[PDB]
Amino acid sequence: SKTAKIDWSHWTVTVPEENPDKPGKPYSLGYPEILNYAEDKIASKYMYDDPKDKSVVFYAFPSGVTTANTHYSRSELRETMETGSNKVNWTFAKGGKMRGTYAIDDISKEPDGKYSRVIIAQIHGVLTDEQRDLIGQKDNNAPPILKVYWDKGKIRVKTKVLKDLNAPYKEMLSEHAWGDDEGRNFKEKIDLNTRFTLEVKVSDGRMEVILNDTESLVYDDIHMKKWGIFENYFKAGNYFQSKTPGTFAKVKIYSLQVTH
Known about the structure:
By secondary structure, the protein is mainly beta. It has helices at residues 129-135, 169-172, 222-226, and strands at 5-6, 11-18, 26-29, 47-50, 55-60, 74-79, 90-91, 96-107, 118-126, 146-151, 154-162, 178-180, 184-185, 196-203, 206-211, 215-219, 231-240, 249-259. Strands 2, 3, 6, 7, 9, 10, 11, 12, 13 and 17 form a ten-stranded antiparallel beta sheet that branches. Strands 1, 4, 5, 8, 14, 15, 16 and 18 form an eight-stranded mixed beta sheet that branches. It is classed as structural protein. The entry lists the keywords alginate lyase, b-elimination reaction, b-jelly roll fold, endolytic enzyme, structural protein.
């Protein structure tokens, strides 16, 4: 192929720029209009081809336009395991694997001279409509159980923990029941402009993140078991973790594969 190996039939994209038809909401493309990204006057600014090395660039920066739970701007893919649908999602028991080949093509520094941080892969929980309505929530949001960062020359992983292990079901369904773990870093330093591979392997009660098919960070304790009540979708691209004026990142993806 002349372009990156990304199966567009299983992703939507949200970008930093406002949707003119939904003031205050970021522009997005799903299937099949997402295939037109190179020619879309809005999206092609933020998701575009590098034909020289067959990558797709995800370019993001603080735009002031974000979605409801989001807080930072993004140029990022959201997995649709069923082409055309947001509502079909997977449990950890069902499982899933995502493989991507990435490079951090460019990124800003913060005023203290340290690089800005960027989230390049996630697993995001999502409530079913039945769960949402059980607890009376305004939308289907649920915590990002996995966030994978590029952070000052390392790949860093953050996961969620259940704060109270005897919390009842309806409490467990709320984001307030889930806190952050302490974070874990891969040993291998990843410089800018360096291809690396990420693989995320999810199965019942178990989440594994692999860098360059060498080191694995494995999550398999009680919190992964408790997390089984959620459905999930993968995310990949550039969820940019700064609002400092003038900051940005560009994340290249050469290959992206999801299986269930």
